[PDB]
Design a protein around this ligand. Structure first.
Ligand code: CL
Ligand code: CL
Lengths: 89, 103, 100
């Protein structure tokens, strides 16, 4: 047969092209799970940054308080140095 | 009559061959459209690999920041302790001076 | 007739191919449903790209802030060393006054 041979060839190409397509979808189905994992990886990093930001803000506030206290203690140390300047050589 | 018997088999098998061809064309079209999308979705395999590495990098950056913040917190706590101790000493010196003036 | 027999046999052959073609069309329909489902991943990957872009800028900012905090702590420690020297001198002066 001349035309039957032409159809068998086209059908074989069809089956082959469909089979190759089905293999790719099975491969791409894994990306659904990998995307779920990455979504959770980002969720975790966002909470780690949330915590770091709180800690850094608290540290900044502590540094500002320490600086202010030290300035006012130095005022008192200088006063004490001047008082002793009047008394002991 | 034997012409009509013949015309019928020619038309029957012709209609079957035409329906086949139209259906094969639909098949090829549907397959071609499907192949275009998979080529497009194959890029996501590489993009997911890049994102995995991007997260791996950010986790190590957070690991380092957490160590640095913990060290800074420890230093602040020690500084606060030292300042509390020095405050006790400044107050004692203030009282000693007042005792000299009141003498 | 030999010819009428081959005309019917090649006709039978095409009906068998039509059945196979129908199996194919069903297999392509199932495949098309999956691609529509996987098209959502294109958007999800775009969202994740942006999520990482945001986290990188948050880390950039934290690193600057932590470096600035570290510098401030080092300066405070250095100033405390000098204040300690002064308190100790004042304590020694007072001990000398009260021992006199
Ligand atoms: Cl201090
Ligand atoms: Cl003092």
């Amino acid at each position: 047969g001349k035309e039957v041979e032409n159809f068998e060839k086209n059908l074989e190409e069809c089956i082959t092209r469909i089979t190759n397509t089905e293999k790719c979808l099975k491969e791409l189905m894994e990306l659904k799970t990998k995307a779920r994992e990455l979504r959770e990886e980002c969720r975790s990093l966002r909470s780690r940054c949330d915590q770091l930001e709180e800690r850094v803000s608290a540290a900044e506030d502590e540094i500002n308080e320490i600086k202010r206290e030290g300035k006012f203690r130095e005022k008192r140390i200088k006063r004490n140095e001047q008082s002793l300047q009047e008394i002991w050589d």
